[PDB]
Design a protein around this ligand. Structure first.
Ligand code: HEM
Ligand code: NEE
Length: 435
């Protein structure tokens, strides 16, 4: 308006809206958009202006500008110690940029050939060490959280590295490094000591693994050959983070996505889809190749995307408005915190009629509406990988099994975590091994 978008009333001040927010952001965010007569709007959070972009037409405005205009570094100040000063968001954009490439060139579909089979294997194991019986009660959020970590390491970890680390141990270290995070952080330590310990431990372990490599093509090795613009290379420090960042990025996001996808599918209300998910994975063999998942599982791919569409794991993508930028009919003043929310966006009823309904064969009725993997200058570099894991798993686990939920309703998102997934205590599921 030659000026800033609409704002929202602060009943109890200098808290902002994190009071009514934290309980349910979706209930909340929807109130404001309807109430404020605008898909876009600003909110108070600790006195700090937060402008949420909730009109899907506008996503382009959010995801297109380069970091110098809209910086994401300021949001993730939280974890500079988790990856190391000068790694990821901690690094400078030119370097941060270069690092992104390194990881990217490690996850391209060029490296994905052994992956498919490497995946079928690691899951099939897990189940036999766990779903031993022909009827069992298992917590899916936890059983998935594990398989994802397993198969990912089976994919990006060298045989020698995986001998000196096992998923279990490595996960428990990521979960050591993580627990030093609390909800109100982006808007304002013996844990930094436990964070640095679990890290310095890993950082050392890795180096050793290197001593043995040289003296004699995985993610590690890949990052080793990595050369910066100026011919400089990564310090073990920088390296270490990168592997963590990679592993962290995919850990919760992927497992949750797998959990939800399974949760939807094992539902009776959702049988036809499961039935379609079979006419798909039926004539395949217990030996899956790249062609199989990639070019022949298209329906399955819809289910995973829908699940991410319905319950996005990252509710808010955020930037720092170093400079002004027009957004629809409004402007954004330097110093604002702008954000775009996949959770809000994926519920806009123009783009998604019955947003809470789970429809795999639905398509976005506003191009760009779906952002589960981001968009623009920052689209997910892990997207292709995550999908390959999840598709193969659902296929693996639905081929040799049938499922039922100890519930009537699929679980409810738990909004108390920085990375949202289905309510843990609801996930307990029970399997009937096929034969
Ligand atoms: C299916 C699960 C996944 C979901 C829901 C997801 C979601 C997202 C979202 C919303 C962004 C953009 C964030 C922003 O705009 O600031 C993003 C980018 C990113 N993702 Fe993921 N992702 C997933 C899988 C993965 C996996 C498996 C990896 C690791 C290989 C990964 C690594 C990254 C990295 C490094 C970026 C950087 C984007 C940037 O800052 O330019 N993601 N993802
Ligand atoms: C910027 C960056 C982020 C990386 O992963 C992250 C780190 C923090 C937050 C996110 C957001 N995310 C989660 C899942 N997909 C993206 C992803 C990894 C690397 C190597 C780099 Cl350079």
């Amino acid at each position: 308006a030659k000026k800033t978008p609409p704002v929202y009333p602060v009943t109890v001040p200098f808290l902002g809206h994190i009071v009514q927010f934290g309980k349910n952001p979706l209930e909340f965010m929807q109130r404001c958009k309807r109430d404020l007569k605008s898909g876009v709007f600003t909110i108070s959070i600790g006195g700090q202006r937060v402008t949420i972009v909730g009109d899907p037409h506008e996503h382009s405005r959010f995801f297109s500008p380069r970091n110098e205009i809209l910086s994401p570094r300021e949001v993730y100040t939280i974890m500079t110690p988790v990856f190391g000063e000068g790694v990821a968001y901690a690094a400078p954009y030119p370097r941060m940029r270069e690092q992104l490439n390194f990881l990217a060139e490690e996850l391209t579909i060029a490296k994905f050939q052994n992956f498919v089979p490497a995946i079928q294997h690691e899951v099939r194991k897990f189940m036999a060490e766990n779903w031993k019986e022909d009827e069992g009660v298992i917590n899916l959020l936890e059983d998935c959280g594990a398989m994802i970590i397993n198969t990912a390491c089976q994919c990006l970890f060298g045989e020698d590295l995986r001998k000196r680390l096992n998923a279990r141990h490595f996960a428990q270290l990521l979960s050591k490094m993580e627990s030093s995070l609390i909800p109100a952080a982006v808007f304002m330590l013996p844990q930094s000591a436990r964070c640095r310990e679990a890290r310095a431990e890993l950082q050392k372990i890795l180096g050793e693994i290197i001593v043995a490599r040289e003296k004699e093509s995985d993610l590690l090795g890949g990052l080793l050959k990595a050369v910066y613009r100026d011919g400089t290379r990564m310090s073990l420090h920088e390296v270490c983070g990168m592997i963590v960042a990679a592993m962290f990025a995919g850990q919760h996001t992927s497992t949750i996505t797998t959990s939800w996808s399974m949760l939807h599918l094992m539902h009776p209300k959702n049988k036809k889809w499961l039935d379609k998910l079979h006419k798909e994975i039926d004539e395949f063999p217990a030996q899956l190749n790249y062609d199989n998942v990639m070019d022949e599982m298209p329906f399955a791919e819809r289910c995973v995307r829908e699940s991410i569409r319905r319950d996005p794991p990252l509710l808010m993508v955020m930037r720092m408005v170093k400079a002004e930028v027009k957004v629809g009919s409004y402007v954004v003043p330097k110093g604002d915190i702008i954000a775009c929310s996949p959770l809000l966006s994926h519920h806009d009823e123009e783009a998604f009629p019955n947003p809470r309904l789970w429809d795999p064969e639905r398509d976005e009725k506003v191009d760009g509406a779906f952002i589960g993997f981001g968009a623009g200058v920052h689209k997910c570099i892990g997207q292709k990988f995550a999908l390959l894991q999840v598709k193969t798993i659902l296929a693996t686990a639905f081929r040799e099994y049938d499922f039922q939920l100890l519930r009537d309703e699929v679980p409810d998102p738990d909004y108390h975590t920085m990375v949202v997934g289905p309510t843990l205590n609801q996930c307990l599921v029970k399997y009937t091994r096929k034969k």
